[PDB]
Design a binder for this molecule. Structure first.
Ligand SMILES: [Sr+2]
Ligand SMILES: [Sr+2]
Ligand SMILES: [Sr+2]
Ligand SMILES: [Sr+2]
Ligand SMILES: [Sr+2]
Ligand SMILES: [Sr+2]
Ligand SMILES: [Sr+2]
Ligand SMILES: [Sr+2]
Ligand SMILES: [Sr+2]
Ligand SMILES: [Sr+2]
Ligand SMILES: [Sr+2]
Ligand SMILES: [Sr+2]
Ligand SMILES: [Sr+2]
Ligand SMILES: [Sr+2]
Length: 407
């Protein structure tokens, strides 16, 4: 490995090993030989008589230039991977003739054009400006892209634009054993499925990705691999599924969607914003953050509330705050009582001054109500109802700053 750029008149001959050099506008026939070599160019066009061959092996050409189109230049050959990285790396780079793409530190926004099918991008260092991946042919109905984040420490991959791609696979990969969390802003307006894998966290900014109906990070491993996702789906009556991984995840649906959110292992936070949502915390002390009231027929159902889990109701205390204390006895009615009668009994009091919380059990499930209205009738859209699937006792569970911790 030589770190200083070779003089343009200097001949370099690599061997059967993995050699790495920097070139300018060379006037000589540079040969890298066998092995997986790496060549970093500071000029897209070599000098008169100059050429560089990557030789046998899987060879990396690093474009430290503002724009490149190496498949058009016969002076370059034998390079399988194209990396855009360097203090001058920038502009639009032709991916034709390359089977893999890489991205490092850059001087400004980078675009990969003519990206062939089954060609992935690996981000190795924080780039500058938006990275745009333009597929050679995105006309298909089922286009897939494999984006990889690979780093030893936390990697801010920046904004990556994948237009016309229907499935985005994101690998958040840690090369050492110390837990870290990557960040990424995904612009993929045609994506319907996002799948996250790897052994590192991912805080994914998802703004504008309105077609996603599936976020699957269930394969992510590592207790420290925190995954953060906020759904952007705005389709009326849409079904959306959001799965966390092994990490302490923060998963948020959308008000318009019927979100199925599954936290997986770890201390997960599942945020309810509206619709008919289904929350499964999984193992671990999970938090169900209730930020919208919902309606009497479109509310959240928590499938696995257990001792240790919490129920955050700060967002739904329309009037004042829910008083701190242990939950009293459940509301109990007659043998033929309906859910509507249970709802009215829970909301029979006056919540206009300060919202009150009550609970009951009906049909084999447990319900939590927040009454914020003076009337004796449950008011849909003003008073809230939360459903817990099993019969769970909330008698010894206490409210602390509007958070109920199951005991
Ligand atoms: Sr070599
Ligand atoms: Sr080689
Ligand atoms: Sr070429
Ligand atoms: Sr080669
Ligand atoms: Sr090539
Ligand atoms: Sr497409
Ligand atoms: Sr690490
Ligand atoms: Sr929802
Ligand atoms: Sr999790
Ligand atoms: Sr969990
Ligand atoms: Sr749990
Ligand atoms: Sr909240
Ligand atoms: Sr309040
Ligand atoms: Sr009331």
């Amino acid at each position: 490995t030589l770190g200083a750029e070779l003089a343009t008149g200097l001949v370099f001959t690599g061997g059967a090993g993995a050699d790495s050099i920097l070139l300018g506008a060379t006037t000589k026939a540079i040969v890298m030989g066998a092995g997986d070599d790496t060549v970093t160019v500071s000029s897209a066009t070599l000098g008169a008589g100059g050429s560089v061959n990557g030789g046998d092996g899987t060879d990396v050409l690093v474009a430290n230039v503002n724009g490149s189109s190496f498949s058009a230049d016969p002076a370059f050959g034998g390079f399988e991977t194209l990396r855009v990285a360097g203090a001058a790396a920038q502009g639009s780079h032709n991916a034709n003739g390359f089977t893999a793409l890489q991205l490092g530190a850059t001087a400004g926004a980078t675009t990969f054009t003519n990206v062939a099918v089954n060609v992935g991008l690996t981000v190795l260092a924080a780039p500058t400006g938006t990275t745009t991946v333009t597929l050679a042919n995105a006309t298909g109905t089922s286009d897939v892209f494999n984006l990889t984040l690979s780093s030893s420490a936390a990697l801010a991959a920046g904004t990556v634009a994948l237009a016309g791609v229907e499935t985005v696979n994101i690998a958040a990969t840690d090369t050492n054993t110390t837990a870290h969390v990557d960040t990424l802003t995904l612009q993929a307006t045609s994506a319907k499925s996002i799948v996250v894998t790897g052994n590192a966290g991912l805080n994914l900014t998802n703004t504008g990705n309105t077609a996603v109906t599936s976020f699957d990070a269930s394969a992510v491993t590592g207790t420290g691999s925190a995954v953060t996702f906020v759904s952007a789906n705005t389709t009326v009556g849409e079904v959306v599924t959001i799965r966390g991984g092994a990490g302490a995840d923060s998963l948020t649906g959308s008000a318009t969607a019927n979100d199925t959110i599954i936290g997986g292992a770890g201390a997960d936070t599942l945020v309810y914003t509206g619709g008919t949502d289904t929350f499964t915390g999984g193992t671990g002390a999970d938090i169900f953050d209730i930020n919208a009231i919902g309606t009497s027929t479109a509310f959240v159902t928590i499938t696995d509330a257990a001792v240790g889990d919490k129920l955050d109701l700060v967002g739904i205390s329309t009037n004042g705050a829910i008083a701190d204390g242990a939950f009293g006895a459940a509301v109990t009615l007659g043998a033929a009582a309906t859910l509507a009668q249970y709802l009215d009994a829970a909301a029979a009091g006056d919540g206009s001054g300060t919202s009150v919380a009550k609970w009951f059990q009906f049909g084999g499930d447990t319900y939590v109500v927040v009454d914020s209205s003076a009337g004796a009738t449950f008011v849909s859209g003003a008073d809230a109802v939360i459903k817990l699937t099993g019969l769970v006792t909330l008698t010894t569970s206490a409210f602390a700053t509007e958070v109920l911790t199951l005991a």
